[PDB]
From a paper:
We have focused our work on the iron(II)/α-KetoAcid-dependent Oxygenases (αKAOs), a mechanistically diverse superfamily of enzymes that use dioxygen as the oxidant to catalyze several reactions via C-H bond activation, mostly hydroxylation. One of these, KDO1, catalyzes the formation of (3S)-3-hydroxy-L-lysine, while five others, KDO2 to KDO6, promote the formation of (4R)-4-hydroxy-L-lysine.
In KDO1, the L-lysine complex shows a well ordered lysine in monomer C. The interacting residues are Glu180, Arg332, Asp 234, Asp 268 (salt bridges 2.9 Å; 3.0 Å and 3.0 Å; 2.9 Å; 2.7 Å), Ser168 and Ser236 (H-bonds 3.2 Å and 3.3 Å; 3.3 Å). The size of the KDO1 pocket is smaller than that of KDO5 due to Ser168 (instead of Gly). In the closed form, the lysine or hydroxy-lysine/succinate are covered by the adjacent loop and the active site is locked by interactions between Thr167 (P5) and Ser236 (P14). In the absence of the α-KG, unlike what is observed for the lysine-KDO1 complexes, the lysine is positioned differently in the four molecules of lysine-KDO5, suggesting that this substrate is not properly stabilized.
Author numbering: 34 to 358
The structure:
C-alpha cells in the first residue's frame, strides 16, 4: 500500500556499507560522538539518496513517511531479545546504516523515559506486555497514535530499521492529508480547536517519576499548521474530548483511519521513516513465538532542532531527561 519508496541500488547500498566504517564511536556509551560522526559521514552518501532524504526532511507535501529498501543485509544477527532492556540493535551494522540515513534527515535524540534513553531501542515482542498499548505488544492491535502525543518535545521523525520481520505484523500509516480529504469543513475546523486532553504513555511512567507538565495535558487541538499541509497530534487510546461533539469527532478520525490507512509489512534490509508531524501510525496483531527469531526492529528518534531540547539535556548529551517529557 505504501507510496513513498526509496529503493537503494546495489552500488548505493555498497557506498552506505563503506561510509558506515567512518562511524566508530559507541552508539550507547558515546551517543553524541556517534551521532556527530554519522552527521559528518552522511556527506559521503550517494547524492540521489541525500537529495531524497533532504526533500523528505523539508516536509512540504511529503507523504507522511518514506520507506527505504535495499539497505545492506545484516549477516550475523544475534537472537531477538525477549525484552527491550538489552539494547541489542545498537551493536549491529544496521544501526550505523540507520544513523547515516537518520543524520541526513535531522539530529538523533533519545528520551530517558523511553527505552532507558538507548540511542536505538529494541522493538521486540514482550510476553508480559503482549496485550498492552506499547511498542512491545503483539496480541492486540497497537492503536492509532502520534509518537509521544502528550509531549511538546515529541520527535519530528520516528526511524524504524527492520532486523527481523513477522509476516503478520503490518505497520499502518495514515497522513493528516488523508484525514482532511474525508472530512467536512466544520469537522476540520473543530479538529483545529483545543478540545482534547492527553495523558503520558504507559512506557513513560515509573516509580517516583514526576513530569514538570503533569500526567494529564491539554486540552490541545488534533490538527494545526497550513490548510494544505496539516500537522496532527492524535492518540486513539489516550485522547479524551472535553465535550460530546469532541468525543464524536475523535471516533470520526478513527473511522477515517480504518477506511484509508496504508499497510506495509517491514522486512529485513528495510527502513521506515515516519514524519511524526504529518502522519499517525499503528500496528496489527501478530503471534510471536519468543524463540529468539521474532520480529525485531531498531527504533530511533529524529529532531530537526537540537536547541529545543537543550534545557532538557546535558551539554554534548543526546538524552532528554524524564521530567521534561
Ligand atoms: N509510542 C508507544 C506506543 C503507542 C502508545 C500510544 N499511547 C511505545 O513506544 O510504547
Ligand atoms: N513506592 C515509593 C514511592 C514512589 C512514588 C510512587 N510511584 C516509596 O518507597 O514510598
Ligand atoms: Cl524536540
Ligand atoms: Fe509508537
Amino acid at each position: 500500500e505504501v507510496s513513498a519508496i526509496l529503493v537503494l541500488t546495489s552500488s548505493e547500498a555498497s557506498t552506505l556499507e563503506r561510509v558506515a566504517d567512518l562511524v566508530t564511536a559507541h552508539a550507547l556509551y558515546a551517543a553524541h560522538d556517534f551521532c556527530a560522526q554519522a552527521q559528518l559521514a552522511a556527506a559521503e552518501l550517494p547524492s540521489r539518496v541525500v537529495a531524497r532524504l533532504q526533500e523528505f526532511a523539508w516536509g512540504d507535501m511529503n507523504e507522511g513517511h518514506l520507506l527505504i529498501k535495499g539497505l545492506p543485509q545484516v549477516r550475523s544477527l544475534p537472537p531477538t531479545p525477549t525484552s527491550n532492556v538489552h539494547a541489542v540493535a545498537a551493536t549491529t551494522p544496521m544501526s550505523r546504516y540507520q544513523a547515516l540515513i537518520n543524520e541526513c534527515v535531522g539530529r538523533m535524540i533519545a528520551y530517558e523515559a523511553e527505552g532507558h534513553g538507548h540511542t536505538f531501542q529494541d522493538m521486540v515482542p514482550s510476553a508480559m506486555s503482549a496485550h498492552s498499548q506499547t511498542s512491545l505488544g503483539s496480541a492486540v492491535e497497537l492503536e492509532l497514535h502520534t509518537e509521544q502525543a502528550f509531549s511538546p518535545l515529541r520527535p519530528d521523525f520516528v526511524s524504524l530499521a527492520c532486523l527481523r520481520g513477522d509476516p503478520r505484523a503490518l505497520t499502518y500509516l495514515f497522513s493528516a492529508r488523508q484525514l482532511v480529504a474525508t472530512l467536512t469543513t466544520q469537522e476540520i475546523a473543530m479538529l483545529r480547536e483545543p478540545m482534547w486532553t492527553t495523558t503520558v504513555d504507559e512506557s513513560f511512567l515509573a516509580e517516583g517519576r514526576t513530569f514538570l507538565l503533569g500526567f494529564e495535558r491539554g486540552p490541545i487541538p488534533i490538527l494545526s499548521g497550513a490548510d494544505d499541509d496539516p500537522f496532527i497530534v492524535f492518540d486513539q487510546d489516550l485522547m479524551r474530548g472535553i465535550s460530546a461533539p469532541a468525543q464524536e469527532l475523535q471516533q470520526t478520525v478513527i473511522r477515517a483511519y480504518y477506511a484509508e490507512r496504508v499497510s506495509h509489512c517491514l522486512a529485513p534490509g528495510e527502513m521506515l521513516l515516519i514524519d511524526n508531524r504529518r502522519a499517525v501510525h499503528g500496528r496489527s496483531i501478530f503471534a510471536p513465538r519468543f524463540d529468539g527469531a521474532d520480529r525485531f526492529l531498531s527504533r530511533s528518534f529524529i529532531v530537526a532542532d537540537g536547541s529545543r531540547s537543550r534545557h532538557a539535556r546535558s551539554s554534548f548529551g543526546r538524552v532528554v531527561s524524564a521530567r521534561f517529557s
